[PDB]
Amino acid sequence: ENLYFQGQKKVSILGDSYSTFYGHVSPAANLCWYGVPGEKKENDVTKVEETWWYRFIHEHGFQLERNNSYSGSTVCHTGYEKADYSDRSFITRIHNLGTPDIILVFGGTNDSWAGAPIGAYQYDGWTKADLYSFRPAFCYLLASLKQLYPAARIYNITNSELSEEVTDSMDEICRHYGIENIRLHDIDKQWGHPSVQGMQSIDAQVWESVSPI
Ligand SMILES: [Cl-]
The CATH number of whichever domain residue 53 belongs to comes to: 3.40.50.1110
Separation of CA 16 and ligand 1 centre (Å): 12
Q: Ligand 1: distance of its center to the CA of 148 in Å?
A: 14
Could you tell me the end-to-end alpha-carbon distance of the chain, in angstroms, rounded to an integer? 15
Nearest Cα neighbor of 108 from 118, 97, 122, 94 is 118
**Ligand 1 centroid – CA 24 distance (Å):** 14
d(CA 46, CA 148): 35
Dihedral-angle region of residue 23 (phi above 0 means left; psi in -120 to 50 means alpha; beta otherwise): left
Q: 191: helix, coil or strand?
A: coil
Expressed in angstroms and rounded, the spacing between residue 76 Cα and the centre of ligand 1 is: 15
CA 18 – CA 91 distance, rounded (Å): 18
Domains in the chain: how many in total? 1
Q: Report how far ligand 1's centroid is from the alpha carbon of 68 (Å).
A: 7
Domain hosting residue 186, numbered range: 1-213
DSSP state of 48: G
DSSP per-residue codes, 56-80: HHHHTT-EEEEEEE-TT--SSSB-G
Looking from the CA of 77 toward its CB, the CA atoms found within 13 Å total: 13
Vertex 146 angle, CA 98 and 87, to 5°: 60
Q: 212 C-alpha to center of ligand 1: Å?
A: 30
Distance 27 CA to ligand 1 centre (A): 6
- Cβ-based neighbour number of residue 140 at 10 Å: 22
Distance 2 CA to ligand 1 centre (A): 34
How determined? X-ray
Resolution (A): 1.9
Q: Could you tell me the strand order of the sheet in which 153-158 lies? A: 63-69, 10-15, 102-106, 153-158, 180-183
Cross-strand partners of 181: 156
Q: DSSP for 83-130?
A: -B-TTT-GGGSTT-S-S-SEEEEE--HHHHHHT--------S---TTG
Residues counted in the chain: 213
